Structures are given as structure tokens and as C-alpha cells.
Design a protein around this ligand. Structure first.
Ligand SMILES: Nc1ncnc2c1ncn2[C@@H]1O[C@H](COP(=O)(O)OP(=O)(O)OP(=O)(O)O)[C@@H](O)[C@H]1O
Ligand SMILES: Nc1ncnc2c1ncn2[C@@H]1O[C@H](COP(=O)(O)OP(=O)(O)OP(=O)(O)O)[C@@H](O)[C@H]1O
Lengths: 353, 353
């Protein structure tokens, strides 16, 4: 019966020669939670997963599973199970069971198979699996060992959108049930928001932020994070903090007394507002800000209508629900939800919000 | 100066041995329009593009460019330019100019470069192109020839989301300007809805439907099309046409006097309603239909909240704008926009709407 093991990553560093793949990573994965390591290629997420698995040792640092320092133990002694990417399903799931009693194997395979709802496909073969999913079999074999830490690396990279989504839900629910500490690696910001109880955004080997999808989405602490989750991406416009307003390359926004930019008056900061936190008059937000402009391009995707409006010299994207194929050239009155606005220091790109 | 050439595909068939890649395709691409051939892998879209280019001959059929039968002419005599996937930009774009006068080349390169807004990168090299996009150079070289028919095959397959979108707009506007007949191939339904003036949905070598993004989206003539454009996919539930209502595996929907199913009373048809055409009480549609159910899973993507609600034995997806992380288990009252409902015959999967 699966346990809820807390995992600690202390001052973890990994560098191949001169290149630092992971720089002083300090992270505490809460026992039984589903943590996701989101980030672009080369950010260090995969190298961090491998070190946790034991397939790769740290250049410096320590790794804990519960109170045990597992930093220097073989991947086999860490009670873990990796999940990436001629026999029968039963055999496929029993495989990982490695000096194991048959009487025990049958109980585990029945257990796993039932959790992945594939008990009925047990006596079938791979290419024959037309009554289920070879995917679900892969997971069952993953949990059949009853690991303390479940590790996954872009497990749904090659799946048709529709199916993939189904697996996101399949996996998340299973984990919510087993309550097994899971660390999930992926570059897909949508998939991260769907599965992680908390998400750890990475870049250039560093941990930029960690928290619930709600926190990293509504309150990102920097430009990178603010733009890596949520698409269309958040609009970032360069501006100058005047009195109680902001001036852009051809526009201004009245800043209600907010104005936590008192230390940036006369200086330049980064304005931020998501396409979904804007709209157009003639289509309720407590406080708002207006700016008129002409539509430069429209993305009538049927289920959404993304507009490319020209704010002075700048160009931003506005997201409207449904199919609203307005035509380019026409002028619209953009309405900004002042409560969803963000402001980042231009140098440290750190939020000031 | 580019011309507006109408392209006709008459009873086009292409079969490698016993396999039919394209079955009796009849299509009329309107001069100067941007037509998109959307469809999954193996549908025949690419083989149709190649036959148009002349790189591949038909097994039967005829192809017209204007009043000229170009079916059996070398790709070079068809005045076309393909676009798929050490020199200087100027050189790169001049390359296609193949017995050409320099005095003429300079005018064309200047022309193209200006249209792709890359005149300032002309004396630069590929890997050095840090001030623009090697992508824009590719297109400029494509139009530099001044083709009658512009052909493109998944040109943006390997581009980071953000960039890709920029190219969709870049390309579409350029074409809207040049008014050159363009046939665009892609499996991306979103990209299709963004660029095609009309879209031709294909599958198993057949043309299922053609029309504006608005038409194929709001009024698809079959299950396939109705589910291939718009994601999350349209919900399809099997039902029986009673009096003025529909009965599902655990639910019913009052059908206002609609009811064009008079010939399906007592029979079974396919109910259809998109996730974006539904909602939840407590969050205006002229006519509606209700059904209560419990949330099975939630996709809080920040910019959208996709719910997986259990309608009786069936499970459907509802799309709500914004971040509304409701919790699983809770029961919601789903509201269906009766005006966005579709009904397809269960056998021919052809719409009855
Ligand atoms: N053996 C190695 N030698 C040199 N550099 C390496 C080695 N392994 C990984 N790297 C570097 O690590 C980074 C990849 O990080 P990982 O943490 O591997 O990235 P992802 O997981 O972000 O990317 P990927 O999907 O390619 O693994 C790259 O910047 C790459 O150059
Ligand atoms: N030379 C060939 N010999 C046998 N089959 C072929 C050949 N060329 C294409 N096909 C078949 O054509 C179909 C691919 O259609 P195309 O019209 O090529 O598809 P897509 O454009 O839908 O897919 P792809 O991206 O692979 O080209 C497949 O069903 C494939 O088996």
C-alpha cells in the first residue's frame, strides 16, 4: 500500500564540465502531492528528474526521501518508478516483478489493472489492445511496484490531442487516489495547469517560482513565468511611471490610488495584462482602463476570437469567447481589467505587480 | 505583377497501386483566394498539393490554371512556387532567378524584401539573421518568382507557438495583399481557421466539405468535420428521437417546434453540442435546455476552465472563460444553447442538424 513520502532537494547543482544544467536547486515536494516541473527545453527539468531517480548523481547537493538521504543510492533502492516516452498485459504488468512471489504478483497485477480500469484486457496482447489503451497498461506497470516517488518525463508527448487530454485526467485522478508523491516533467504549460497540485517553473537551470496553478497564473513573480503559462501569452508593454498613470509608446493608463510604483516614478517598467483580461466595448469588471485602436488581424478560431489591436506603436492581443470575426481596419475600444494588471521591474524582470 | 488565377481540379484520382490516396476530387479554387486543405495524416491533402505542383501526375482527372489544362506540364511551366518545411539574404531571394537579368533581379528582390519587411536584412547571412526571421526570407524567395498559384505544405510545423502564430498572420496578410491564389496544406485546425478564406476538410482521400471557417464551424455537414475543427471537440451523444424531445443514456432534451427529425422518430441519431456552446447556471442564450450533473474533472487552464460533467452515463466537456477551478464531485446545472445544437444520422454521419 503506497506511502506518502516527502522529497527534499537541498542545494542541488549539476554541471557537465563547464555548463551548469541545474544551479543550487532547493525544493521540497510535499508527500503525496503532484508536483510538476514546467519549463522550456534545456531548463534543467529532465536533469532534475534523473538525479531524483538516481540515474544521475549531483555535482553537489543532497536528496531526501522522508528522513533518508538517498543521494548516493542506486535507483533500485530508492523505491521509485520511472515513466517516459510480444507479452500479454498481465505479463507486461508483472514483468517488473525482480525476485517476486507469484501469489503476490497476481494480487498486485489485479490491483493495478483494476486501478487503470483494464482488468478486462489482462489476457490480451499489445497490437491486439483494441479494447483499451497500451497507455493505461504502461501506468499500471508503473504503479504495480508500489513506489514511494512516482517519476514521469513527458509521458504524453506522442498522443493525439484528444487522447492526451484523457490521459492527463486518467493520471491525475489515479494519483489523487493513490496519493503517491509524483514529480511530473513537461514543457506543456497547459498539461502542467491540468495536473500539478503545484507547479515549479524552471529556466536556465534555476527555479523561478513554485506554487498552485492559481498562484503562478494570477500572481507570477516575473516576466518569464507570467509569459510561459497562459496562451495567447500575456501582453508586455514597456512604460514609464508618471504620477498616477503609465505612459506607453502612444497611450496612457490612469492608475488608481494601486500605484505601488512610487519608487519607479519617472522610471521605466514593464506593463502586463493578459489577452483574456481585456475586451471590447459592445460585447462585469469592477475597475477598468480604456484605449482605442484599430484591429490589425483577427483569429476567428470559432471557439475564440483573438484580436491583434494596435495600441499606439505597440500591438496587443485581446481574447473574446466565441466566433466574433470582426474585420481588420475597424476601430475598437479596448477595455482593460485594471485588477488583472501586472508590473515588472525592467531589469530584474521581477514583479512589482 | 501577380495575377489572380482560378484553379480547377476535375474528377481527380490518385492511387499508388491498390491504395487510393485521392478519390475523385472535384474542387474549384477561386482566383486570388486563400484555400486551405485541412485533414489528418493520410487524408490525401499533401498528395493533392503535389499533383497541383506537377511533382506528381494524376492516375485520372484533369487540372486547370485559368483556361489552360496544366495536367501534363512540368512543374516549371505551371508558374508556381512551393513552400514547405552560406549565401546572403539578397542572394537567397535572387537564387530562384534560372536565366534572369540582373537589372530585373534587383527590382524583384527589392520588391519581395519590402513585402516581407526584411529590406534591412538583405546584406546579412542566415545564422546572422538575428535582426529578423529566416522564415520571412523563405517566403520572399517564394513570391520573388511571381507565381500564379502559391503552394504551401505545413510551412510552420517546427516553430515555437508564439512565432508560428506571427507567421500565420504574416503570411495571410501578404496573400491578402498580393491576392495570389494560394493553396495551403495543414493538419492544424486552428491554423486553418486563421488563414483560409475557405477551408477544404479531407479524410480518406475524400472531400467532406468546403467553405468559410464560419460555415464549416457553425454548420459542418457531418460528424468528422464537426469534430475536426474546434477544441475541445464537439460533444457527440447517441440518442433516440421521441416526440419533441431526445433521450440519452440517462437524460432527455425538450425539442422546440426545430424537430426536423420527423423522419427519425423512434430511431437513433447523433446529438451534437460544442463545449463552448454550453455553460453552468450561476456564471444570454435565447433558447436553452437543462441537465444536472456532477463534475468529474476540471481543467483550470487559467484562461479557460474546461469541465468534464457526467450526463447520465455519458460524459461531456463544458468550456467556461477564465479561471474557475470548481471542485470535482460538486453538482452543476449545465445549460445548453439549443440554437447551437446539431444532429447527424447515425449511419451516414451526415448532418440533419
Ligand atoms: N551529457 C550532457 N553533456 C553536455 N550537456 C548536457 C548533457 N545533458 C544535458 N545537457 C544540457 O542540459 C540541458 C538540457 O536540460 P534537460 O534538463 O536535459 O532539458 P529539458 O529537460 O529542458 O530538455 P531535454 O528535453 O532536451 O532533456 C541542455 O542545455 C543541454 O545542453
Ligand atoms: N508512394 C506511396 N506509396 C504508397 N502509399 C503512399 C505513397 N504516398 C502516399 N501514400 C499514402 O498516402 C497517404 C498519405 O497522404 P498525404 O496525402 O500523403 O497525407 P497527409 O498529407 O495526410 O500525410 P503525410 O504528412 O504523411 O503526407 C497515406 O495513407 C499513405 O500510405
Amino acid at each position: 500500500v503506497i506511502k506518502m513520502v516527502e522529497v527534499k532537494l537541498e542545494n542541488l547543482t549539476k554541471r557537465f564540465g563547464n555548463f551548469t544544467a541545474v544551479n543550487k536547486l532547493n525544493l521540497t515536494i510535499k508527500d503525496g502531492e503532484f508536483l510538476v516541473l514546467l519549463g522550456p527545453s534545456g531548463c534543467g527539468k529532465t536533469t532534475t528528474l534523473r538525479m531524483i531517480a538516481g540515474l544521475e548523481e549531483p555535482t553537489e547537493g543532497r536528496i531526501y526521501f522522508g528522513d533518508r538521504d538517498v543521494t548516493y543510492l542506486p535507483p533500485k533502492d530508492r523505491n521509485i518508478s520511472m515513466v517516459f516516452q510480444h507479452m500479454t498485459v498481465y505479463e507486461n504488468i508483472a514483468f517488473p516483478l525482480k525476485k517476486f512471489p507469484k501469489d503476490e504478483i497476481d494480487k498486485r497485477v489485479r490491483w493495478a489493472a483494476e486501478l487503470l480500469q483494464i482488468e478486462e484486457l489482462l489476457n490480451r496482447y499489445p497490437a491486439q489492445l483494441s479494447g483499451g489503451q497500451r497507455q493505461r497498461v504502461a501506468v499500471a506497470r508503473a504503479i504495480v511496484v508500489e513506489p514511494d516517488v512516482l517519476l514521469m518525463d513527458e509521458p504524453l508527448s506522442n498522443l493525439d490531442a484528444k487522447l492526451r487530454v484523457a490521459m492527463r485526467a486518467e493520471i491525475k485522478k489515479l494519483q489523487q487516489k493513490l496519493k503517491v508523491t509524483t514529480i511530473y516533467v513537461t514543457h506543456d504549460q497547459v498539461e502542467a495547469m491540468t495536473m500539478g497540485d503545484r507547479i515549479a517553473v524552471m529556466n536556465r537551470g534555476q527555479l523561478l517560482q513554485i506554487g498552485s496553478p492559481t498562484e503562478v497564473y494570477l500572481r507570477p513573480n516575473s516576466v518569464f513565468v507570467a509569459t510561459f503559462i497562459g496562451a495567447p501569452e500575456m501582453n508586455i508593454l514597456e512604460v514609464s511611471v508618471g504620477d498616477g498613470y503609465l505612459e506607453g509608446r502612444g497611450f496612457r493608463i490612469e492608475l488608481p490610488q494601486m500605484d505601488l510604483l512610487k519608487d519607479y516614478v519617472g522610471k521605466t517598467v514593464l506593463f502586463g495584462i493578459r489577452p483574456e483580461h481585456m475586451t471590447v466595448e459592445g460585447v462585469h469588471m469592477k475597475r477598468t482602463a480604456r484605449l482605442i485602436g484599430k484591429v490589425d488581424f483577427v483569429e476567428a478560431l470559432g471557439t475564440d476570437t483573438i484580436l491583434h489591436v494596435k495600441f499606439g506603436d505597440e500591438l496587443v492581443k485581446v481574447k473574446l469567447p466565441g466566433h466574433i470575426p470582426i474585420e481588420p481596419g475597424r476601430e475598437v475600444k479596448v477595455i482593460m481589467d485594471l485588477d488583472m494588471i501586472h508590473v515588472f521591474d525592467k531589469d530584474t524582470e521581477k514583479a512589482i505587480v
